[PDB]
Design an enzyme around this catalytic site. Structure first.
Site, short mmCIF file in Angstrom:
data_model
loop_
_atom_site.label_atom_id
_atom_site.label_comp_id
_atom_site.label_asym_id
_atom_site.label_seq_id
_atom_site.Cartn_x
_atom_site.Cartn_y
_atom_site.Cartn_z
CG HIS A 165 -73.35 81.23 -12.77
ND1 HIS A 165 -74.42 82.09 -12.24
CD2 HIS A 165 -72.85 81.74 -13.87
CE1 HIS A 165 -74.54 82.95 -13.39
NE2 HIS A 165 -73.64 82.96 -14.32
CG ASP A 178 -77.11 81.36 -10.49
OD1 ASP A 178 -77.51 82.53 -11.29
OD2 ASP A 178 -75.82 81.30 -10.51
CG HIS A 232 -78.42 91.78 -16.84
ND1 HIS A 232 -78.56 91.51 -18.32
CD2 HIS A 232 -77.36 91.54 -16.46
CE1 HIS A 232 -77.53 90.96 -18.51
NE2 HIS A 232 -76.54 91.03 -17.55
CD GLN A 257 -56.86 84.71 -9.79
OE1 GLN A 257 -56.43 84.21 -10.66
NE2 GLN A 257 -58.10 85.06 -9.77
CG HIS A 300 -60.98 86.67 -17.15
ND1 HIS A 300 -60.48 86.37 -15.91
CD2 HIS A 300 -62.04 85.86 -17.42
CE1 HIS A 300 -61.30 85.67 -15.10
NE2 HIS A 300 -62.26 85.19 -15.90
CD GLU A 306 -60.21 85.10 -6.17
OE1 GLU A 306 -59.30 85.21 -7.00
OE2 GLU A 306 -61.13 84.24 -5.99
CG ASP A 360 -69.42 89.84 -15.30
OD1 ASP A 360 -68.78 89.29 -15.88
OD2 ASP A 360 -69.55 90.01 -14.07
O1 LIG Z 1 -55.26 79.46 -11.96
C1 LIG Z 1 -56.19 79.90 -11.61
C2 LIG Z 1 -57.06 80.53 -12.33
C3 LIG Z 1 -58.39 80.99 -11.57
N1 LIG Z 1 -58.73 80.55 -10.52
C4 LIG Z 1 -59.83 81.06 -9.89
O2 LIG Z 1 -61.14 81.10 -10.76
C5 LIG Z 1 -62.00 81.97 -10.52
C6 LIG Z 1 -62.36 82.59 -11.84
O3 LIG Z 1 -63.42 83.50 -11.61
P1 LIG Z 1 -64.01 84.43 -12.32
O4 LIG Z 1 -65.43 85.32 -11.83
O5 LIG Z 1 -62.87 85.87 -12.15
O6 LIG Z 1 -63.78 84.24 -13.76
P2 LIG Z 1 -65.03 84.07 -14.82
O7 LIG Z 1 -65.52 82.58 -14.30
O8 LIG Z 1 -66.29 84.85 -14.65
O9 LIG Z 1 -64.61 83.95 -16.30
C7 LIG Z 1 -61.50 82.89 -9.52
O10 LIG Z 1 -62.21 82.68 -8.33
C8 LIG Z 1 -59.95 82.58 -9.38
O11 LIG Z 1 -59.41 82.61 -8.12
C9 LIG Z 1 -57.74 79.96 -9.63
O12 LIG Z 1 -58.10 79.48 -8.47
N2 LIG Z 1 -56.46 79.46 -10.18
#
Ligand SMILES: O=c1ccn([C@@H]2O[C@H](COP(=O)(O)OP(=O)(O)O)[C@@H](O)[C@H]2O)c(=O)[nH]1
Length: 436
Positions: free
Chosen positions: A15, A114, A145, A320, A335, A343, A359
């Site tokens: 967030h 937020d 929602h 990533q 996931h 991305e 979500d």
């Molecule tokens: O090895 C990793 C794994 C995840 N991420 C970052 O962690 C974030 C995960 O956010 P996302 O909204 O997909 O997952 P959530 O937090 O909703 O479970 C993304 O910006 C990814 O780029 C990263 O930089 N390196």
């Protein structure tokens, strides 16, 4: 400084990161405005550890009390921590906003929050300033929602009454929507957000209108200003890659040959499912790069790590967005977190969906059935057969050619949105008119 803007983060999950990115963009565009960013110490250290933090002349970061006992270590669940933070709110923010105003010598002229922090409406009203809400996920999740009332009142019926969610199953909906009896603190908060959001000056998203034009038009009719300003990643010179991911991908000759896998930084499937995924990777013989924590890596079959030493690479963390932008990456096993999906769209990489919570299920349904930029797994888990099938379909099939054209079209739409005259370019200038 002429202006002082207060920004309140939800200090959990992913967030705080996208909200800080938007503050950094506003701070760049408004050098005479001071932005005070209110977040928990734990979340702020997560941000500096993931390198999202940067030093601006016009951004000040303040620690807000996260509701945990001070002096003792916190050996509680995420659930407990979220409960404690919400019980401490909004007094925790009020205290620190006042000390920001006295230490800067400027009253806040605007409150950005937020969207989860429904009490932004009260904190803004009390100060006589606009309340701007930042939704951290896709338009589709926000719409689900906003229709909580219509959904609870009564499959086909729900598909018939939410514009743009005709492909959504009941099982896909954020289940906070059904937490209606003795709700957990998080479900109380999101229900109060659904009631207060239409009273905001603006609702801001890190998405683009064109990913869901029907949902975008619907939500514009619900809010004073509904402003898609993303993707932020496309609208900041990179450090150098000390993980070895980029050097390893560079040695992969064929374009779109590599399977990138990440379930985020925290969650992993059961050990039996990591094993089934490891067997699928061996069977397919596609080069792979897997972001997986060292504890989870140790529970993989011992023969798997030995056998795949020349085929794949496993790291505890990957850069990533830089991985996804590499021309050797052919697919992303995700996931289905919104940041990860966006991305992927921004780099034109198709998806294989293994959602976990929130979500993520709805995002995976939009990926397969609305956007058509990837596939879900037969039976929702990374079974050997379901994974071999999914990797084959996306990487080398006629169905893969269709998914490729769809992800290239969405990629193109995302680039046009952030370019001059684009929907997000225009919406961001609209947001600057409000905050200045
Ligand atoms: O090895 C990793 C794994 C995840 N991420 C970052 O962690 C974030 C995960 O956010 P996302 O909204 O997909 O997952 P959530 O937090 O909703 O479970 C993304 O910006 C990814 O780029 C990263 O930089 N390196």
């Amino acid at each position: 400084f002429q202006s002082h803007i207060g920004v309140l983060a939800f200090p959990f999950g992913t967030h705080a990161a996208p909200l800080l990115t938007v503050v950094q963009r506003l701070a760049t565009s408004s050098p005479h405005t001071l932005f005070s960013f209110f977040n928990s110490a734990v979340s702020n250290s997560t941000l500096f550890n993931n390198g999202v933090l940067d030093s601006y002349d016009n951004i000040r970061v303040y620690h807000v009390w996260d509701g945990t006992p001070q002096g003792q270590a916190f050996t509680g669940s995420h659930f407990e921590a979220v409960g404690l933070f919400l019980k401490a709110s909004p007094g925790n923010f009020d205290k620190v906003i006042d000390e920001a105003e006295v230490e800067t010598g400027l009253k806040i002229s605007c409150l950005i929050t937020d969207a989860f922090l429904w009490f932004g409406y009260d904190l803004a009203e009390k100060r006589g300033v606009p309340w701007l809400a930042f939704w951290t996920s896709a338009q589709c999740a926000l719409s689900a929602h906003m229709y909580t009332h219509e959904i609870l009142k009564a499959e086909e019926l729900i598909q018939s009454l939410i514009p743009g969610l005709e492909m959504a199953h009941l099982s896909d909906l954020p289940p906070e929507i059904f937490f209606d009896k003795n709700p957990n603190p998080l479900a109380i908060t999101i229900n109060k957000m659904v009631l207060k959001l239409p009273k905001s000056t603006a609702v801001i998203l890190n998405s683009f209108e064109e990913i869901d034009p029907i949902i975008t038009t619907d939500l514009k009719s619900k809010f004073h200003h509904f402003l898609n300003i993303g993707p932020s990643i496309l609208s900041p010179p990179p450090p150098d890659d000390k993980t070895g991911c980029l050097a390893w991908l560079d040695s992969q000759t064929r374009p779109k040959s590599v399977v990138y896998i990440s379930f985020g930084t925290v969650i992993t499937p059961p050990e039996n499912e990591l094993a089934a995924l490891s067997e699928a990777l061996e069977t397919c013989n596609y080069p792979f790069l897997w972001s997986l924590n060292d504890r989870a890596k140790k529970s993989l079959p011992t023969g798997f790590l030995d056998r795949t030493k020349e085929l794949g690479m496993i790291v505890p963390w990957a850069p990533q967005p830089r991985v996804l932008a590499h021309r050797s990456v052919g697919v992303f096993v995700t996931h289905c977190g919104w940041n990860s999906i966006l991305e992927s769209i921004c780099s034109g990489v198709p998806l294989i969906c293994r959602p976990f919570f929130g979500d993520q299920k709805l995002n995976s349904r939009m990926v397969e059935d609305s956007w058509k930029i990837g596939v879900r797994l037969e039976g929702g888990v990374l079974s050997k057969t379901a994974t071999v099938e999914a990797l084959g379909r996306v990487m080398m099939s006629e169905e893969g050619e269709i998914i490729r054209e769809n992800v290239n079209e969405m990629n193109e739409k995302a680039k046009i949105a952030v370019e001059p005259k684009g929907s997000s370019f225009k919406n961001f200038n609209k947001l600057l008119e409000i905050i200045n």
